[PDB]
Amino acid sequence: DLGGCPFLVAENKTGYPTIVACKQDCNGTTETAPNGTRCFSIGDEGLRRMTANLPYDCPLGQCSNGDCIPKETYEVCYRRNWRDKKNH
Ligand SMILES: *[C@@H]1O[C@H](CO)[C@@H](O)[C@H](O)[C@H]1NC(C)=O
Ligand SMILES: *[C@@H]1O[C@H](CO)[C@@H](O)[C@H](O)[C@H]1NC(C)=O
């Protein structure tokens, strides 16, 4: 019974995933990533609103107590759908 499910990610030009929020809904189950996990602080809708295959500078951060805390560095990043095809 229940629960949990994987976090969404963006990748760099080569496909290395970095998650994009530190919390998730799983239907009504909430997950929180461990304090310290790499993440981009852009959010699930931040991810959805990104044009498939185009590059964004995504602000890097580290997770703490469920929020991606930015670290003022930035890194070049990507939303890739199945078969690279176009968003939404
Ligand atoms: C993305 O990251 C991984 C490890 O952090 C690395 O081996 C790879 O070359 C990276 N891709 C680019 C284009 O920077
Ligand atoms: C993670 O870090 C925060 C604040 O730095 C702390 O208050 C919190 O209890 C920590 N949680 C765990 C399980 O490490």
Residue numbers in the entry: 8 to 95
Provide the publication's sentences verbatim:
We have determined the crystal structure of both non-glycosylated (accession code: 3 fpr) and glycosylated Evasin-1 (accession code: 3 fpt), to 1.7 Å and 2.70 Å respectively. Crystals of the glycosylated tick chemokine binding protein produced in Sf9 insect cells using the baculovirus expression system were obtained as described in the Methods section. The structure was solved by molecular replacement using the previously determined structure of the non-glycosylated form of Evasin-1. The unit cell contains 3 molecules per asymmetric unit: monomer A (Asp8-His95), monomer B (Gly11-Trp89) and monomer C (Asp8-Trp89). The corresponding solvent content of 67% and the glycosylation content may explain the 2.70 Å diffraction limit of the crystals. Monomer A had the lowest overall B-factor (53.9A3) compared to the other two monomers, had the largest stretch of visible amino acids (8 to 95), and will thus be used as the reference glycosylated structure in the discussion below. Residue Asn19 was the only one of the three predicted glycosylation sites, which displayed clear electron density for a sugar moiety. Only one saccharide unit, built as an N-acetyl D-glucosamine, could be successfully modelled into all three monomers of Evasin1-glycosylated on residue Asn19. Asn19 is at the C-terminal end of the 1st β-strand (β1) and is well exposed to solvent. There is a clear hydrogen bond interaction between the acetamide group of the glucosamine and the side chain of Thr22.
Anti-chemokine activity has been described in the extracts of tick salivary glands, and we have recently described the cloning and characterization of such chemokine binding proteins from a tick salivary gland cDNA library, which we have named Evasins. Evasin-1 is a small 94-amino acid protein which binds CCL3/MIP-1α and CCL4/MIP-1β with very high affinity (0.16 and 0.81 nM, respectively), and also displays lower affinity binding (3.2 nM) to a closely related member of the CC chemokine family, CCL18/ PARC. This chemokine-binding protein does not share any relevant sequence or structural homology to any other known proteins, notably the viral chemokine-binding proteins, and moreover, is considerably smaller, being only 10 kDa compared to the viral proteins which range in size between 30–40 kDa. The Evasin-1 secondary structure is composed of seven beta strands forming three anti-parallel beta sheets, one short alpha helix, and contains four disulfide bridges.
